[PDB]
Amino acid sequence: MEMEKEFEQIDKSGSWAAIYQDIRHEASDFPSRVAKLPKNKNRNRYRDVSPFDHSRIKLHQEDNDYINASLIKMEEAQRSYILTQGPLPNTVGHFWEMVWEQKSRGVVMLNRVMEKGSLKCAQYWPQKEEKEMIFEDTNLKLTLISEDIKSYYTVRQLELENLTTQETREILHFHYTTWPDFGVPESPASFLNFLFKVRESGSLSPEHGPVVVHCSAGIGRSGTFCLADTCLLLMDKRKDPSSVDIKKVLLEMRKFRMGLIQTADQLRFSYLAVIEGAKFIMG
Numbered sequence: 001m002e003m004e005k006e007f008e009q010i011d012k013s014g015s016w017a018a019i020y021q022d023i024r025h026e027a028s029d030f031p032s033r034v035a036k037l038p039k040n041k042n043r044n045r046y047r048d049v050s051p052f053d054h055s056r057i058k059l060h061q062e063d064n065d066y067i068n069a070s071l072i073k074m075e076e077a078q079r080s081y082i083l084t085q086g087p088l089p090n091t092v093g094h095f096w097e098m099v100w101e102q103k104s105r106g107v108v109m110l111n112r113v114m115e116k117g118s119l120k121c122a123q124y125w126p127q128k129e130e131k132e133m134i135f136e137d138t139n140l141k142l143t144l145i146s147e148d149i150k151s152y153y154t155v156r157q158l159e160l161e162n163l164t165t166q167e168t169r170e171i172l173h174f175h176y177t178t179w180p181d182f183g184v185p186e187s188p189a190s191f192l193n194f195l196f197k198v199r200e201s202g203s204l205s206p207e208h209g210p211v212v213v214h215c216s217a218g219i220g221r222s223g224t225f226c227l228a229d230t231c232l233l234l235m236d237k238r239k240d241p242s243s244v245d246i247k248k249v250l251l252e253m254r255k256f257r258m259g260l261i262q263t264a265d266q267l268r269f270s271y272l273a274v275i276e277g278a279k280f281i282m283g
């Protein structure tokens with residue numbers, strides 16, 4: 001079926017939970033043996049969220065190459081994404097090592113450091129220009145260059161320096177700051193505006209490594225971001241945009257990381273975002 005009328009048909013019939021459970025039943029199951037090794041327990045935020053072995057990002061380190069991060073490679077859309085958990089106190093150096101080694105231009109953050117009165121990720125970037133951060137375990141230096149605070153999101157320019165080689169690179173930090181503590185946003189308008197700002201920066205384009213996207217577990221809000229982006233790109237590429245099937249795209253993405261889209265409300269919100277976004281694109 002088309003999307004917008006399939007949407008109204010699920011609303012009128014109140015069957016979002018059943019649609020979402022079907023997706024959960026059909027989703028891929030691949031091994032995640034490296035994630036479960038005892039030496040990696042303090043590298044995982046949640047015991048039930050792990051990268052598959054076949055798609056995990058490897059650190060370029062001979063001691064321990066493990067990070068909780070996955071490469072989502074979308075062949076028809078010609079887009080790739082790295083989805084990862086919010087960094088932990090003992091993985092902030094690994095996180096920036098990955099950004100460096102994978103040649104990423106942009107980092108997309110969809111959570112606040114504290115939500116619901118608890119810590120959802122480490123403070124992994126500097127908050128003042130004159131107070132830079134040094135990660136001694138991976139030999140990187142990170143400096144805040146500029147910050148632009150808007151009503152729904154903040155964009156930061158960061159400098160990452162590899163202290164071994166003295167090479168430097170500019171990284172863009174895109175921080176969506178207004179996702180509610182509970183539920184999903186009422187309108188997708190600010191989330192779509194944010195997606196378009198990431199696109200306009202070059203961070204999603206083939207001349208760079210994959211964008212790094214995270215929330216707390218790296219599957220819920222993060223899944224919504226890449227699902228909406230890929231579906232909109234396919235609607236622009238194809239002769240028949242009504243042939244894009246959001247459930248099929250989501251199942252394709254779940255071949256590369258488990259659990260993408262965590263609730264039926266997040267699924268409905270993803271439909272809403274693609275539907276509204278397809279009208280603004282045109283034409």
Ligand SMILES: O=C(N[C@H]1[C@H](O)[C@@H]2O[C@H]1c1ccccc12)C1CCC1
Binds near residue numbers: 061098139164
């Ligand atoms: O090359 C880098 N760091 C080097 C450190 O001197 C040390 O050797 C390298 C390294 C890599 C992983 C852990 C520890 C080390 C950074 C470029 C991204 C990582």
